[PDB]
Amino acid sequence: EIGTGFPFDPHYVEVLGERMHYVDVGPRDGTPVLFLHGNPTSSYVWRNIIPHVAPTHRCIAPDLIGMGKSDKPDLGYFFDDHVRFMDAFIEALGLEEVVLVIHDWGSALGFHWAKRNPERVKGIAFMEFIRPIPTWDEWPEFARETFQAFRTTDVGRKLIIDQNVFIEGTLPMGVVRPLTEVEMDHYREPFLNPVDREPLWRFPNELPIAGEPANIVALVEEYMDWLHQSPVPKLLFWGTPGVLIPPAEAARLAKSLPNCKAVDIGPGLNLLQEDNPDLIGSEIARWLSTLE
Ligand SMILES: [Cl-]
């Protein structure tokens, strides 16, 4: 059975006058592995993956601002707010060189950072990552009406903020196997208070879809141009049928991205971590092996 426990001792660091939570496990005598979650997860999404990596590499898994066990400041929780706090989280921890393990909005933060800091990235493992969605036709059919409603200051806030539909609906529906009530309760925890749900609603409004928002669309094209031209070692997890990365997209990228390996996880949607953690773990560990 896939583990439901989050046993990890808390760590805290002051970043821009707020306290951010993170997991820190593993030896301090090598290159650290920075795991970045997306919406609407936390470090909890990495709980069954980090045990495969910890024995050889230090594993750092922050909760983005507003999320997991990090403070809940009074921000709009824009993408740019996340960039500011994650930039400072890495400097706050004195990291020089890192390997990145990134997903969804974590892949936006990771690829934006890697583009700005090429010389400090020794590898990127990624899955179900943000690329520009030129029209709604490129967004999956089944997700199309949901996300169109989310992108309204009236209907979106009713669903996500008042009813918490991102947690109760969107989240478990991004997983092929059924999440257990214990799993749901971990993902529920940060967001028991409705006013604390602002980041859950902002992010979908920040997705780069049919040219808007303009600024995110530009930011994401730039890190894609960089990713396409970087020689950095790359490891892409994909599943069938996926959501943000269909199999066809994965195969093209496997072939075109320099120095990139692809690992089919099997049946998979958005949260690949919840469907085959053991393989994601062991492939990351084995891929770290040979970066030496
Ligand atoms: Cl989102």
Curated annotation (Swiss-Prot):
GO biological process entries = response to toxic substance
Q: In which pathway does it act?
A: Xenobiotic degradation; haloalkane degradation
Q: Which UniProt keywords apply?
A: Detoxification, Hydrolase
What are the GO MF terms of this UniProt record? haloalkane dehalogenase activity
Its Enzyme Commission number(s) read 3.8.1.5
- Asked if the keyword Acetylation belongs to this entry, the reply reads no
A Pfam family hit: Abhydrolase_1
**TM region(s), chain numbering:** none
Q: Which residues form the active site?
A: D104, E128, N270
Annotated GO CC locations: membrane
Q: What class of enzyme is it?
A: hydrolase
Q: How does it assemble?
A: Monomer.
Similarity remark: Belongs to the haloalkane dehalogenase family. Type 2 subfamily.
Instruction: Name the job this protein performs.
Output: Catalyzes hydrolytic cleavage of carbon-halogen bonds in halogenated aliphatic compounds, leading to the formation of the corresponding primary alcohols, halide ions and protons.
Q: What is this protein called?
A: Haloalkane dehalogenase
